[PDB]
């Protein structure tokens, strides 16, 4: 029997309730679906749509009885979805796709993209305060894997992530962000494989390289807990202990690897932490030799920018941790994977379903000393037919990253799906992200989207559902 969910997240569970319950209702975002096999027929049909919702009777039902309709039609090769709040933007929004025009709220295409999606697993940067706890409060399923992964962590370092989660007061630091944003990205993930979706492959960037290994089937989810659990630990342990001359910085530079190897030769100590895009390279090392690189590229006119960590992970200032590392991970049973992976750990090379495990301890190890090849394994996605990209994260910071490499290969139209944002209500971001998915063709069941209708009254009196 693992832990269960601590007495003081259960209070703090309880205020944020209270504090909910206490704010004004804003309206839901509801997906309204359209298609045919022709992309004029799917227009037409957009257009009877508008002019019924214009309509006395259209205007009295709900959007979601609307929604709910749509949802059991034959859902064909032309699609496009408007996401609306009310009946105004549902018909603005559905008369730009009659008319072909594009709009913040609606996505149209003549027909699906041809290979599955890659889900896109990060996590640097992309933490805040409040991350993943409007979603924990109000969605059920996601909040069931919150708990899930509290319960492992609880077992594995002997706190609860959850606590921080629902505790505003509480903010995170080098360890504590690791295991959360792990926690949201399993939440997350399942949440998806819950509404139908599945990744046809898997990218990992650092810490999230052990979600990465769970959805890919490589480890079960124990194990990547404790991969997670490992490497957060001794990162933090390790970092707040370094003063003087044992300090490393971090910093992203606009450089790219073979501007790099260039620049490098004026510097001895400097490492390649992240191959972030094809003109981004986060470094690391000595602070006078990181100032001096940050000095070197703002006189070049390129972006450069310092983190905040006193220590460099993906250097050879992990190595004191190494041993640790190894011992820590004893008895993980890395497994065959279910789907494809573009190993950023190994250089960006790509592992079909099937093949041999690779998630071993030495994977994790050579993961947390070595280079993150993150825009290689992008590129290697795009040149083997990829085009939707989908990040699980509490901010889509890592999507930024694939957009530069999608289009440095020539891929100019990219679907770029991000999960939660801050200041995005995270309920209608995943609304967003499932509807993204259907109108692309991927494996989602737009059903699934609403409720199960209790009576007449859930449903709108146009096809199918007309009232006899
Ligand atoms: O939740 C808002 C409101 O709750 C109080 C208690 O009434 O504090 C609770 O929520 C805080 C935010 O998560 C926690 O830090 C605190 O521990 C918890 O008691 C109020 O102080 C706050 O205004
Ligand atoms: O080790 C000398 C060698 O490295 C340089 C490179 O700029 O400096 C670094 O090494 C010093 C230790 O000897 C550190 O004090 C310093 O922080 C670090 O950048 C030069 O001193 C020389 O070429
Ligand atoms: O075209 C089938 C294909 O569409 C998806 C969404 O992209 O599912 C839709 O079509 C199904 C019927 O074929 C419905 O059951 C479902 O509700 C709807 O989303 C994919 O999942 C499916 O492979
Ligand atoms: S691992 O354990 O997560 O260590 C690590 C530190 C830093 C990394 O940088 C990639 C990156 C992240 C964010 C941004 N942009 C922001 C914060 O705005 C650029 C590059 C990766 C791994």
Known sequence: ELPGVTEE??????????????????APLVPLAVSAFLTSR??????????????????????????????????????????????????????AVAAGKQAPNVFSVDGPVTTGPVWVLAGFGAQHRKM???????????????????????????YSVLELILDDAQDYGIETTQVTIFAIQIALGELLRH????????????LGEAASAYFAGGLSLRDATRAICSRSHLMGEGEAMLFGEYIRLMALVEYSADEIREVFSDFPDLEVCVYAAPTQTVIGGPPEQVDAILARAEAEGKFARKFATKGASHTSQMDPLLGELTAELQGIKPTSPTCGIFSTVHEGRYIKPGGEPIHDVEYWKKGLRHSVYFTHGIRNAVDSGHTTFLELAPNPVALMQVALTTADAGLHDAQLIPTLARKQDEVSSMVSTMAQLYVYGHDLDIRTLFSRASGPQDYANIPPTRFK
């Open 9 to 26: 997240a259960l209070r703090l569970k309880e205020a944020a309730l209270e504090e909910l319950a206490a704010q004004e209702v804003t």
């Open 42 to 95: 799917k227009k037409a049909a957009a257009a009877e749509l508008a002019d019924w919702m214009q309509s006395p009777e259209g205007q009295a039902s709900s959007l979601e009885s609307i929604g709910r309709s749509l949802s059991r039609r034959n859902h064909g090769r032309s699609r496009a979805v408007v996401l609306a709040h009310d009946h105004d933007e549902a018909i603005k929004g559905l008369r």
């Open 132 to 158: 993943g706890k409007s979603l924990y409060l109000r969605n059920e399923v996601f909040a069931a894997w919150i708990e899930k992964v509290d319960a492992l962590v609880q077992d594995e370092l002997g």
């Open 195 to 206: 509404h139908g979706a599945k990744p046809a492959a898997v990218i990992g960037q650092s």
